[PDB]
Structures are given as structure tokens and as C-alpha cells.
Write a protein that binds this DNA or RNA. Structure first.
Ligand SMILES: Cc1cn([C@H]2CC[C@@H](COP(=O)(O)OP(=O)(O)OP(=O)(O)O)O2)c(=O)[nH]c1=O
Ligand SMILES: [Mg+2]
Ligand SMILES: [Zn+2]
Length: 1263
DNA sequence: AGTTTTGTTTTTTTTTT
DNA sequence: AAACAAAACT
RNA sequence: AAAAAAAAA
DNA sequence: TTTTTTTTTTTTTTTTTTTTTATAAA
DNA sequence: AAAAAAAAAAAAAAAAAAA
DNA sequence: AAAA
């Protein structure tokens, strides 16, 4: 059945009235709602929005008069066919269908005068549209029969004519037909003390048999009662979820602890398996939470329900006769009830504003949502069927979507004998006994809590509905039972039934047509208890992953970087360009639906081949026993199906298991000598991988390429892995177009002429184009992106954070992937383009020089791309000093003269020859940048405490390599580990024992070098912070942030200081501690950027003045804009102008009321600089709030010829108190809050009038 | 004795697959 | 980017 | 609207 | 081959030129 | 009054010619 | 107003 509701609302222009209505509609939950007298103009129709009723149709005039609206619930599929709106807003007709049945709804608001004739005229005008499926409802402003009035007076001739017209149209009064003897009313007329039914529901006589129920509903929103109709229609979808807001309730939390304990204590016994007991526990737990929520919600409304009952008790008696006592009290309570509803409504708005007030102009959800588009809902309206026809039947689309995904996963392979044959043909790694014992070790309680504490928050729960925040809240009681569960699984390899379930959601892939089923990616949601177990297993294998995976693969591997593959490939391209004979090819390959096509039986066989067996293997085997999924579409859950192939795309264990399977193919390609790779001096390069993304470098492609396709064809058979040969691009290099044509004819790949997009960057066929392709468009994009945002409503403080959030990440990624020597025009255009946006295309109010440092401007800091560029180019040196075999990208540059030089450059002796690196793209530029910084710092890098033993210094002496290794093993790796001067080898007994273990003749040579005074002096010096970055840190984590923080201090520049100018406008000198006090206050005055920005703007002299305008305009008119006649200096504007003086005098009266004693000194409120007596005082937090509120008040009317009033200051000061209140109780800082505002609140409430307090809604929140 | 520095810990967003 | 806590320099 | 690794603030 | 001179690039310093129309709230 | 831009000076490294 |  559907429900239709009609109500005259008597206006909706106030926001609160709209919220009350939304609450009332939500509680009624009508399928369709017809509202009259919205009083919204055609310009204000956007104001009417109600959650759950998105489809709304309105007719409105140009005045706040009349206005009607029809709202349809989101749960009702009403496809409209016709909408007719009255130009004056007295009626609206909408025609359409609900679940194939046609329906016509006419919402009418007749005028107070001539209502029966008006309605009759509308009926005639719409006669061609009012079919036998018509319902007419609204406020007719007239009775239809004698029973519609308490007077029982007969209806007039106009009403008689109207009734005749209704009869002519085959329309009847449904309410009167269903309740012929009803003496109920919808409107009360106080002038005559009478009651009448002037709101009506009329409809086609043909619909009478479908009318199940109709009733009148009293309300507090309007002076008219609503009417509801239930209509029979043929139907021809909810699952529980936890609400994290329910966990914060003290009472609720206290009770769940007891029941959780009680369940296990009662149930635990030998009659049931622990895997089953777990599912039973979750069932009971879900049942309890639903009961608690229902009770809580009802309990909350107990008072308002009592008042409603107490009214209702009397509200009906008034129909029989009117009694003064009832009449009077009814009127009193009916208004009082509206107060409670209003007060609780306001609270929910202030609680929202308080949350937003903390996150404004900061890098958090709100600011991100501002630049991003508004989220498009996840729903499928239509889809292209196999017949090629687009279709819209919900049942048909569900059938098509489910059939497609059910089919995909179903085909499991059965040719196990072939899988064994393939896995034997090649040499694969294996774990040793110690490593295998490391995996199969038992599970411990500490291992579990370590995971629970790390789970991500605010993530959608799995099908069972529990969230990560639940486990984190009850980890104290859950961990013991969770440990018992996993300990049971270890022994048996049998999981709880619920662990196999998962919910699928469909994601439309970027840049693809939504009309085709093939374009969407499924994302899987899994239960949190299941993900905890999978996380345990993944962390274990990750310890040993670097033994199984070769360095060629960098996707998902800890400590690797994606730019390794980029640089390595660019170097390879350069080599081919330089080559004199060209017979080479580069190929880019992508696996179609990589994670879904992996055959599970082959994946399990692979693990045994690598030596993984035992309990760890049994648990993995159990996981793939019988996984299933349920697709969720258009909000409703479809029938499950089995997942017989692939890996679960929303699982923490899937990324590693995929890599392990793919390595079987990589090892085969490298071990296959028929596929010729490329030779770079001592390096052979074949392949590079990032997850499923693969790139191959080949030589002699006519033979070499076909052998690759044969191998992959054989691998596809056993593993199910597949590639799209046509969507795979290649670069082909040949001496002649004849040869080129021949290769093109035989191969299936797409030959790219100019460039191939790869891992985020454009790879060019020739390295000369790197800048033009990668950096030139990046500028164009940023120039367009900031232009779109030019009118975004946020201050310069917010705009700065938008650049750091949106633009900075993509710039760094580019510098890091391709550090080529950029022309200075690039940085000029980049800075100009960015500042233009921050200052809203007007000349800057604060010089970029001042914003350069965190010490200044209260923590705001403008980004600096030139130093980020240097910090990235100079980062390569860390990989030179740390000498590692996993870094092959660092060895592929041309080495025509010598390949070894990069090991020797850092903290080692210089070379005479300068011809090396003549064609180096990356490294020659890095060296030049490294030296510039060292000479700027006035260092000798050539011989330092961090100089290695394996260095040219030692190798210039003629020493055996055996000697070098002997030293490094026993003593350490640096020359300082040996010792110099007087401590040559006597540094430790171990060294003195070692001294005889080396060749006498080499020892003689070492003594000479290590004892020289120069060697002693250079090695003994203390290491600088810059030197420690490269030598000390054995991890490259966070490296750019460190280098950048050093460059920021080395290149520090002198600037003007605005605080000195204040010291010149006033006749005083500020000490260094005072200038420091101001800087501190500007930072710590408040936790919200909304309040800090005001203080910063004041100190930094942000505002314009008549003096400045006179100079800029080349005029002599430097007189105060407020007409006081004096010269408009900046100190005059804030402190001295006679218009402003009364407000500051008022503030000092409040300070005296607080019993404080503070001099009348402008530096105190404007700058926060107190004299030495008060530097110890505690009331600074109270004063800070009073003063900042005064600065807002004065600034709001900067150039207005009028005095700032005290009442305006009180409003602003009270606004802050309201925002801080909810934050304090939310963060549980309520003790601090009371200490700050208690005294001030008492004073404020002591000076306002009861009328003023009421008018502005001022009342204590502490009391 | 007083303030400034140095490191870890918790919280945001963006890059690739 | 923030906050807290330990150590060193003024 | 889920997973992994990396980067910055 | 080695050392000094000359040429060029980059970074720092100083002077000269131009500006915006009020602000906070949104 | 204040911020940015343009001009000139200073220093260091590379390249060519002298010793 | 710039979330859920
Ligand atoms: C972008 C993205 C990717 N993944 C994983 C899972 C698959 C692999 C490969 O992704 P790919 O683009 O090749 O897609 P693929 O499945 O290979 O399908 P096509 O290559 O587009 O045919 O990455 C993920 O888990 N979440 C994501 O948001
Ligand atoms: Mg793929
Ligand atoms: Zn004045």
C-alpha cells in the first residue's frame, strides 16, 4: 500500500520551520506529501529540501504568498509524465505512474474569497487531464456538506454548483464516503468559536475500492490538521548496521560489557565447537544492540509524549462543548510544547556549527569537499542488454548484472597434471627450516591487540554490520575469546560460517561508459573479524617476501619506490638512442582483470613448491574452500553466488599472493636465454614490474618477441592469467622502414610513435622530449585548475592550504620521477600562477618574504617549490653512500669512460678527470647540486669522519683487498672506526688484537696515512646536521622532508618586521622577549583558524587606511573615513578614533568587574604584549577572548561613519562561547572550559535585559 | 632555574596498482 | 601539522 | 566506497 | 700536463616603480 | 607606504692558452 | 558552510 498525506503548513520561509516540517514528514513517512501555503517565492524553491524526499514538485509566485508542493519519498518509484504548475502558485498537477499503475494528483490551495467558484474553474481548465485515476487534495477553504461544520449550516449555492461539477467529473469526497457520519474538523475559527472541515481529499469513484483507510492528523506546525489516505497498490530491503554514535553513551556501554561477559560465561561448554559459538555470540550481540537503541529513543521522547497525551485527553472533549478551563490550558500547553521542539532543534544546529568551526581552512574533510565535486550517487537506472537494447526494468537489470558476475567467477580449472609439469620446468626459490618455522609459529594475544589498535577508522562495515570501532572499544573483553577462536582454527583449518560472506558494490571505472556492464569494478566488503585473521597471516609472510620476490618487482613491496622503474626505463631508452645499430623494442603489457582470473588451485600448488606447508598452508587452504559474495544494487541485497576463481579484491592478503604467483612467470622469462635482453656494460636488463603492470626491453625483436608470446601462452593455460595484445603498446627501433614493416606485420602490438603513458608519466620515444611532454603540460593544467577555483569562498589562509593539499603532491611526484635540469622560467610561472590565486588576483597584503618562516605569521607558511626541487635532486646521494645491490636503476646511465665512479663520489677524495658523466641525464646534475650546498656551508666533503674504509683514500695506498675486508669485518666501515693520530688502533682491545691479523707491509702503509696531522684534523672535526642526514640514517623514510628543512635554514633571508613599525607608531621600544611574546600569542591565542586569522591580520598590519589611499591615489585627502576630521593613521583607526573609544572603555569596565587590574595600553589588546607585572597572570585566556571579540566588532564596520555598539560585541563574544562549549564536552575538556568562561558568563548575564536575552537566545550552558 | 630543541605519536590528504 | 616529554644551552 | 605500498603536511 | 686568465652564469643587494577604492560573512 | 621587479656587482667553475 |  501507498500513503498520501496533505497539509497546509502556513509558511516555510524560516529555516527552523523547514526543519520542524522535515522532522514531522520523516515521522509520518508518507509515500507522497501535498503541502499548501509554502509562501516560498519562485526564487526560494531551492530552500525546500527534505532528507528522504528528494523528488519535489512546486508551483510558486513572485511573492511570499500561496505556494504548493508535492513531495515523493525516495522509497517510491513515481515516474512523472506531466507537471502543470499554476503561474500564481494556487495549484500543481502531476501525472505519472507507480509500479505500472497510472495516478494523477492535483494539489490545490483555494483563495479565502470565492473558493468554490475558483475550484470549479480549475476543474474545467484541467478537464482534459482529470482521468479516472485522479486524486484531488488540499485546502479548499470551504465545507462540502453540512457535517463539515459544527454549526451544521447548509452549504451555499457556489458550493452546490461545485458538488455538481465534482459529480459531473465522476469525482467523490473519499473521506465523507468512508466516514459518512464523521463530525471531525481540520480548522478552528476563533472569531465565531466554530470548527470546520475545509481540507479535503477528493478522487475518482473508480479508485474508491482501493481506499483502505483515511484519517485526520492534528499537529503543532500549523493551524490546520492534516489528512492521510492509504491506497491499495501492488508491490510486484533493510539490513542492520551499527551506529558508532551509540557506543559513546555511558549507560549503553556499561550494559554491553555485562552482557558480553554473561554470554560466554553461560554458553562456554564442550557441547559446541568454538567456531559455531562465535557466530551465535554475534547474533545475540546484534539483537541486544537493537533493543538498547529502541529503548533509548523511546525513553528520550517520554516527556513530549506525556504532554501530547495530556492535550489529546482534552482536545477531543472540545468537540462536544467548550469549557474555559480546558480552552485556556490547551492554548498554554500547545505553545509550550513548541518550545521544547524548538530548543532541541537549535541544539542540533549549534552542534553542527561547532564541529565545522574547528575544521575551517584546515586540511581535513571539509576543505577537500570544497574543491571536489559533489558526490554522484551509486545507482543504475538503465543498462545495455546483450540484444543491444537499452533497458530500464529493475528486475531485468538485476538479472543481467547478477548473471554477468555469477558467470565470470564460475570457471575453475581441472588440469592439475599440467600445473605440475610447468612448475617443474623452472628453478624457483624456497624457504629454509628457520623461515618455515617462523610462519607456522603459534598465535599470541599481543599479536592480536597490535592489529586491532591499527585498524583504520570510519570505514564501512561488512555484511554482519559490526565496525572496527566496536572491537577497539571492547578489546579488553574480546581478545581472550578471539584468541580461543584462532587457536581452534590452528588445530582444525575450519572457519566460522560467516567468515566466507562478503558484500559487493559496483564502481564505474574512470573514463568509461556507464551504459556497459563490462566497465564496472567490484569492491568487496568483508567482516572485521575475518580481516583480522587475514591481517595476521599477511604480516607473517611479509617478513620473508624479499627472499621470494626479485628486485624487478616494486609494487606492494615494503621499502621500494615506484620511481625506480621510471628512471631505469628512461636510461634504457637513452642507450638505444645513442646506439649506432638499431634493432631493439620496448613493450608495455597489462593483465586484464588480474586479481579475478587467478586460478586458485594453481596458486595453492605454487606455495607448496616454495616450501610453504603446515598450519600456515592449511589455514590458507581453508580460506579458499567456499567463499561467496552478495551483490548490493540500488540499495537492495541480491542472491549470493560462489567465487570459484581469483582473489578477494578487498582482502589484505590478496596483494602478496598475487605477486607470488606472478613471480613464477618473471623467473621463467629471466631464465629463458632465447629471449635476448639489452646489455648495458656489465648490466643485462629484461623486465620491470609494478603489481600487474609489466614492461619488457628486448633486443633482436623478430626472434625475441615471438619466444615471449609462446612462454606467456603456456603460462596462461595453467594459471588463467591473460593479456590484451592490442591494448599493449610498443616502441620499435630499426635501421630501415622495410624491416619495420616486416616486424609490424608479424606482431600484434600497437606501435606508439611519440609517447607511452606509464605509471603516471609520459615516456617519450626520444629522451630529448622529456621536459616538453611531462613538465610543459603540468603547468598548463595547474593554470586551468586554479582558474576554476578563482571564486571559491575562503580566505587567503584557506587558499594557501588548498595549494599544499591539491597542487603540492603532484608536483613533488613529478620532480621525484624525472629530476632533469629545469629552466628558471618554470619556477617563475609556477610562483606567479599560484600567488595570483592566493591573493584573489589583487596585490598581496603580506609579502611572501614574511610568510617564508614558521616562526613568523603564527604558523602560516607559503610553500616554496625551488627548495623542494633542490631537496629532491640532492636526495640521490643517499643511495650513493648507502651502497646496495638492489639499486640497478643507479647503474644504467652511460658509462663510456668508467662505470664505478658513483660509489666513490660521496665523502671521498676528488678526481682529476672531469669528462665523466658527459651525457648523464640525472646523476651529473645531482653532483653539481651536492657540491654547491657544501661550499655554501664551507665544508670539505672530501675527507670527513664518515669517510668509508673502502675509499679511494685507502685505495691510493697500495693495500691488498683482503686487508680492507679484514678491517671492515672486525672494526667497522669508516676510517674513524679504525682510529687516527694517537688512537690509530689502540681505540679498543679488539682492534689491538686485530692489528696482527693483517699484512705487516700494509700495516706500515696505513700507519703513515692515519698519523698525518692533516688526516687527524679533518677526521676529528664534529659532524654537521647536513652530514648526518646522508651518513647516519640507514632508512630513506621521510628523506625529502629532512633535506627541505635544512635548505630552509641555509637559504634564510632577512625581512622587514611589522612589529617594529608598531613600535614606531607608538613611542616605545619592544625588547626581544616582548617581540617573542607577540609571536607566541599570535600562534597560541586559539585552536581555530577562524579566530587566529583575525589576530594575525591585526599584528601584520593587513588593513588599508586613508593615509595609504591618499599616497596611492596621489592625493592629499588623508582624513579619517569616519568623519572625525583627524588624519587616518593605523593606530588612529583601532585605538584613538573618538567613535571607537566608547567600546574600549566598555571593555575595561568588564575587566574591572572581573576584579582585574590592567593599564589602558593599546599594545595589550592589539598585540598581546603585557608589562612585566602581568606576565605571570593566569587570566590571559579570558582576556584573549574578550579582546578578539572587540577586534571583530570594529573591523566589521571599518569605514562606516558610526560607532560600534556594545551589544554587537556581546553577541560575537557569546557566539564563541557557544562554539567552544560543544567542542569541550566532545573532547572531554569541560574542566578547562568552565575555568575559562565561568566568571565572564556570570557578568554578561548580569547586564542584559530579559527582553534582550530572549530576543537573542542568550542563556547559560554551564548551569 | 628557564626556554628552546629533538624525537615519537596521532591525525589529515594525494600518488601508483 | 600538533602535542607531549626529555635534554641541553642561556 | 574496500585493499596494499609510497610521499607530504 | 698543469696553472693562470677570461668568460659566463647565478645569486645577492639596492634602487626604482606601481598600487586600490573597507571589511567580515559566505 | 609597502611589495615586487629590474639592474649591477661579486665570485666561482669551466675552457683555452701559456709555461 | 565545506560530513557523516
Ligand atoms: C585501481 C585499483 C586497483 N586495485 C588492484 C586490483 C587489481 C590490480 C590491478 O589493477 P588494474 O588497473 O590492472 O585493474 P584490473 O583488475 O587488472 O582490470 P583491467 O586491467 O582494467 O582489465 O590492482 C585495487 O585493489 N583497487 C583499485 O582501486
Ligand atoms: Mg590489469
Ligand atoms: Zn577617526
Amino acid at each position: 500500500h501507498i500513503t498520501i498525506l496533505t497539509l497546509n503548513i502556513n509558511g516555510l520561509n524560516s529555516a527552523i520551520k523547514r526543519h520542524r516540517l522535515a522532522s514531522w514528514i520523516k515521522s509520518q513517512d508518507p509515500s507522497v506529501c501535498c503541502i499548501q501555503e509554502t509562501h516560498l517565492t519562485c526564487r526560494d524553491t531551492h530552500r525546500l529540501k527534505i532528507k528522504g524526499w528528494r523528488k519535489i514538485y512546486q508551483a510558486n509566485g513572485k511573492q511570499k504568498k500561496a505556494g504548493v508542493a508535492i513531495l515523493v519519498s525516495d522509497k517510491t518509484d513515481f515516474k512523472p509524465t506531466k507537471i502543470k504548475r499554476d503561474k500564481e502558485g494556487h495549484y500543481i498537477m502531476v501525472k505519472g505512474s507507480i509500479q505500472q499503475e497510472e495516478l494523477t494528483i492535483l494539489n490545490i490551495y483555494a483563495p479565502n474569497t470565492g473558493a468554490p467558484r475558483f475550484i470549479k474553474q480549475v476543474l474545467s481548465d484541467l478537464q482534459r487531464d482529470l482521468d479516472s485515476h485522479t486524486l484531488i487534495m488540499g485546502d479548499f477553504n470551504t465545507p462540502l456538506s453540512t457535517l463539515d461544520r459544527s454549526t451544521r449550516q447548509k452549504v451555499n449555492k457556489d458550493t452546490q454548483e461545485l458538488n455538481s461539477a465534482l459529480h459531473q467529473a465522476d469525482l467523490i469526497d473519499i473521506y465523507r464516503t468512508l466516514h459518512p457520519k464523521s463530525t471531525e474538523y481540520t480548522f478552528f475559527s476563533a472569531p465565531h468559536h466554530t470548527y470546520s472541515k475545509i481540507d479535503h481529499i477528493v478522487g475518482s469513484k473508480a479508485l474508491l475500492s482501493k481506499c483502505k483507510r483515511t484519517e485526520i492528523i492534528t499537529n503543532y506546525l500549523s493551524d490546520h490538521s492534516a489528512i492521510k489516505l492509504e491506497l491499495r497498490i501492488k508491490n510486484l530491503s533493510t539490513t542492520w548496521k551499527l551506529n558508532n554514535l551509540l557506543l559513546n553513551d555511558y549507560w549503553v556501554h556499561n550494559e554491553m560489557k555485562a552482557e558480553i561477559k554473561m554470554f560466554f560465561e553461560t554458553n562456554e561448554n564442550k557441547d559446541t565447537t568454538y567456531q559455531n559459538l562465535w557466530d551465535a555470540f554475534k547474533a545475540v550481540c546484534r539483537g541486544k544492540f537493537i533493543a538498547l537503541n529502541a529503548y533509548k529513543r523511546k525513553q528520550e521522547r517520554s516527556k513530549i509524549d506525556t504532554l501530547t497525551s495530556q492535550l489529546k485527553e482534552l482536545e477531543k472533549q472540545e468537540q462536544t462543548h467548550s469549557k474555559a478551563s480546558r480552552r485556556q490550558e490547551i492554548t498554554k500547553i500547545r505553545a509550550e510544547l513548541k518550545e521544547i521542539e524548538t530548543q532541541k532543534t537549535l541544539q542540533k544546529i549549534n552542534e553542527s556549527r561547532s564541529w565545522f568551526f574547528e575544521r575551517i581552512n584546515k586540511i581535513d574533510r571539509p576543505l577537500a569537499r570544497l574543491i571536489k565535486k559533489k558526490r554522484e550517487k551509486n545507482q543504475i537506472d538503465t543498462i545495455k542488454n546483450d540484444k543491444g537494447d537499452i533497458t530500464t526494468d529493475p528486475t531485468e537489470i538485476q538479472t543481467t548484472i547478477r548473471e554477468y558476475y555469477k558467470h565470470l567467477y564460475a570457471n575453475k580449472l581441472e588440469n592439475l597434471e599440467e600445473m605440475d609439469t610447468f612448475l617443474d620446468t623452472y628453478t624457483l626459490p624456497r624457504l629454509n627450516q628457520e623461515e618455515v618455522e617462523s610462519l607456522n609459529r603459534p598465535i599470541t594475544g599481543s599479536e592480536i591487540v597490535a592489529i586491532i589498535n591499527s585498524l583504520p577508522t570510519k570505514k564501512s562495515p561488512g555484511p554482519d554490520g559490526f565496525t572496527a570501532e566496536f572491537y577497539q572499544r571492547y578489546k579488553e573483553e574480546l581478545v581472550p575469546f578471539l584468541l580461543k577462536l584462532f587457536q581452534s582454527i590452528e588445530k582444525e583449518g575450519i572457519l566460522p560460517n560467516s567468515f566466507y560472506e562478503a558484500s559487493i558494490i559496483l564502481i564505474p571505472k574512470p573514463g568509461r561508459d556507464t551504459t556497459k556492464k563490462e566497465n564496472f569494478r567490484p569492491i568487496s566488503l568483508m567482516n572485521i573479524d575475518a580481516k583480522i585473521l587475514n591481517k595476521i597471516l599477511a604480516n607473517r609472510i611479509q617478513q620473508h617476501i624479499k627472499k621470494l620476490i626479485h628486485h624487478d618487482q616494486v609494487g606492494f613491496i615494503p621499502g621500494m619506490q615506484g620511481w625506480f622503474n621510471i628512471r631505469k626505463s628512461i636510461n634504457v631508452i637513452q642507450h638505444i638512442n645513442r646506439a649506432k645499430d638499431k634493432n631493439h623494442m620496448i613493450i608495455s603489457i597489462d593483465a586484464e582483470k588480474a586479481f579475478d582470473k587467478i586460478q586458485q588451485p594453481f596458486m595453492l600448488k605454487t606455495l607448496n613448491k616454495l616450501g610453504i606447508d603446515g598450519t600456515y598452508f592449511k589455514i590458507i587452504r581453508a580460506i579458499y574452500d567456499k567463499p561467496t559474495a552478495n551483490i548490493i544494487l540500488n540499495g537492495q541485497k541480491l542472491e549470493a553466488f560462489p567465487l570459484k576463481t581469483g582473489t578477494r579484491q578487498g582482502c589484505p592478503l590478496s596483494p602478496l599472493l598475487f605477486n607470488i604467483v606472478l613471480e613464477v612467470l618473471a623467473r621463467a622469462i629471466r631464465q629463458e636465454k632465447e629471449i635476448k635482453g639489452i646489455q648495458l656494460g656489465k648490466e643485462e636488463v629484461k623486465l620491470s614490474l609494478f603489481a600487474d603492470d609489466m614492461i619488457v626491453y628486448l633486443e633482436n625483436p623478430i626472434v625475441s618477441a615471438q619466444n615471449l608470446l609462446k612462454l606467456i601462452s603456456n603460462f596462461s593455460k595453467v594459471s588463467g592469467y591473460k593479456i590484451n595484445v592490442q591494448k599493449s603498446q610498443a616502441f620499435l627501433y630499426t635501421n630501415n622502414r622495410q624491416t619495420e614493416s616486416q616486424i609490424m606485420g608479424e606482431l600484434p602490438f600497437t606501435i606508439a610513435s611519440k609517447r607511452i603513458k606509464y605509471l603516471g608519466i609520459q615516456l617519450t620515444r626520444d629522451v630529448k622530449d622529456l621536459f616538453k611532454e611531462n613538465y610543459k603540460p603540468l603547468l598548463k593544467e595547474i593554470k586551468e585548475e586554479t582558474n576554476k577555483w578563482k571564486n571559491i569562498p575562503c580566505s587567503w589562509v584557506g587558499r594557501i592550504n588548498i595549494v599544499k593539499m591539491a597542487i603540492l603532491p603532484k608536483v613533488i611526484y613529478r620532480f621525484n620521477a624525472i629530476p632533469i635540469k629545469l629552466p628558471m622560467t618554470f619556477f617563475t610561472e609556477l610562483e606567479k600562477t599560484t600567488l595570483k590565486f592566493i591573493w584573489n588576483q589583487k596585490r598581496a597584503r603580506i609579502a611572501k618574504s614574511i610568510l617564508s618562516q614558521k616562526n613568523k605569521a603564527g604558523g602560516i607558511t607559503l610553500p616554496d617549490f625551488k627548495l623542494y626541487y633542490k631537496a629532491t635532486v640532492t636526495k640521490t646521494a643517499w643511495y650513493w653512500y648507502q651502497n646496495r645491490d638492489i639499486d640497478q636503476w643507479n647503474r644504467t646511465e652511460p658509462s663510456e669512460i668508467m662505470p664505478h665512479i658513483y660509489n666513490y663520489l660521496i665523502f671521498d677524495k676528488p678526481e682529476k678527470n672531469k669528462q665523466w658523466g658527459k651525457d648523464s641525464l640525472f646523476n651529473k646534475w645531482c653532483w653539481e647540486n651536492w657540491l654547491a650546498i657544501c661550499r655554501k656551508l664551507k665544508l670539505d666533503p672530501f675527507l670527513t669522519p664518515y669517510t668509508k674504509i673502502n675509499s679511494r683514500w685507502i685505495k691510493d695506498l697500495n693495500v691488498k683487498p683482503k686487508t680492507i675486508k679484514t678491517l671492515e669485518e672486525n672494526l667497522g666501515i669508516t676510517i674513524q672506526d679504525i682510529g687516527v693520530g694517537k688512537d690509530f688502533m689502540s681505540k679498543t682491545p679488539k682492534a689491538m688484537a686485530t692489528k696482527d691479523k693483517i699484512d705487516k707491509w700494509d700495516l706500515i702503509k696505513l700507519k703513515s696515512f692515519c698519523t698525518a696531522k692533516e688526516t687527524t684534523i679533518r677526521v676529528n672535526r664534529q659532524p654537521t646536521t647536513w652530514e648526518k642526514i646522508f651518513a647516519t640514517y640507514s632508512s630513506d623514510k621521510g628523506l625529502i622532508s629532512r633535506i627541505y628543512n635544512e635548505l630552509k635554514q641555509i637559504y634564510k633571508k632577512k625581512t622587514n618586521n611589522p612589529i617594529k613599525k608598531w613600535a614606531k607608531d607608538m613611542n616605545r621600544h619592544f625588547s626581544k622577549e616582548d617581540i617573542y611574546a607577540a609571536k607566541k600569542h599570535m600562534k597560541k591565542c586559539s585552536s581555530s583558524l577562524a579566530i587566529r586569522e583575525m589576530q594575525i591580520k591585526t599584528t601584520m598590519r593587513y588593513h588599508l587606511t586613508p593615509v595609504r589611499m591618499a599616497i596611492i591615489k596621489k592625493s592629499g585627502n588623508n582624513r579619517c573615513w569616519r568623519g572625525c576630521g583627524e588624519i587616518g593613521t593605523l593606530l588612529h583607526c583601532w585605538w584613538d578614533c573618538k567613535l571607537v573609544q566608547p567600546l574600549w572603555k566598555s571593555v575595561w569596565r568588564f575587566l574591572r568587574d572581573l576584579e582585574l587590574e590592567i593599564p589602558f595600553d593599546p599594545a595589550i589588546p592589539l598585540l598581546g604584549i603585557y608589562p612585566n607585572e602581568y606576565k605571570s597572570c593566569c587570566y590571559k585566556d579570558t582576556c584573549t577572548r574578550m579582546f578578539i571579540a572587540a577586534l571583530f566588532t570594529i573591523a566589521k564596520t571599518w569605514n562606516q561613519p558610526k560607532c560600534p555598539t556594545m551589544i554587537d560585541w556581546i553577541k560575537k563574544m557569546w557566539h564563541i562561547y557557544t562554539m567552544e562549549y560543544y567542542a569541550a564536552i566532545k573532547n572531554d575538556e569541560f574542566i578547562s572550559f568552565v575555568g575559562t568562561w565561568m566568571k565572564l558568563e556570570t557578568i554578561i548575564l548580569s547586564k542584559l535585559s530579559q527582553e534582550q536575552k530572549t530576543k537573542h537566545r542568550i542563556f547559560s550552558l554551564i548551569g
